[PDB]
């Protein structure tokens, strides 16, 4: 099982802790999100284009079934993975860090452009604010430790998970 599965919206900080915390536990970082374009070759779009949303998460499952029992690193799920009954269902009994963030700080943390579908540019702020209500429950009903990242810089968010393995 993974040391630690991390779970959170757009810029919450999943491949960033992600990657430091491996780094810290001297494991591999394993992103869904990678494993699905390295697993098909196509992009994330391409798939959700051509094959749509039911295809893709389909996709998603299996990959994310496979890590969770195959990667021993840090495993980061891609933001929407928990909209997925059969995730939700996998990750039961998993360690889950819920990477908190509130709607103004995430929206800015994402104007990198780092290609965010769901948050096009008219309106990011508003959109993001939906996706919150929209994907929060689901992360707090699959999380099992919550860390807020609010104020806390990258090293202090990794320190503080790392407390609590
Ligand atoms: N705790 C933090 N404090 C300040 N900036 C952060 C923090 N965590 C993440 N960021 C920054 O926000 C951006 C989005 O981070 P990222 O890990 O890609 O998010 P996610 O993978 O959840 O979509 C990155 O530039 C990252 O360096
Ligand atoms: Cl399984
Ligand atoms: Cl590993
Ligand atoms: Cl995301
Ligand atoms: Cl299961
Ligand atoms: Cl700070
Ligand atoms: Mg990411």
Redesign the pocket.
């Known amino acids: 099982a993974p040391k630690a599965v991390?779970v959170?919206?757009?810029?919450?900080?999943?491949?960033?802790?992600?990657?430091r915390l491996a780094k810290a536990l001297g494991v591999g970082l394993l992103?869904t999100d990678v494993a699905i374009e390295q697993r098909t070759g196509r992009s994330i779009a391409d798939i959700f284009a051509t094959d749509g949303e039911q295809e893709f998460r389909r996709i998603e499952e299996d990959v994310v079934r496979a890590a969770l029992a195959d990667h021993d690193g840090v495993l980061?799920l891609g933001?929407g993975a928990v909209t997925s009954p059969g995730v939700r269902a996998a990750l039961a009994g998993h360690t889950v860090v819920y990477?908190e963030?509130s709607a103004a700080?995430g929206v800015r943390?994402?104007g990198?452009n780092?290609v965010?579908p769901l948050l096009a540019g008219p309106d990011r702020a508003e959109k993001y604010r939906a996706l919150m209500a929209k994907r929060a429950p689901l992360y707090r009903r699959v999380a099992t430790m919550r860390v807020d990242?609010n104020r806390?810089?990258?090293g202090?968010?990794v320190r503080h998970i790392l407390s609590r393995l």
Do not use: M
């Open positions: 991390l959170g919206l757009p810029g919450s900080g999943k491949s960033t802790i992600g990657r992103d980061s933001g990477l963030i700080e943390r994402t990198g780092t965010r990242t806390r810089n990258p202090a968010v």
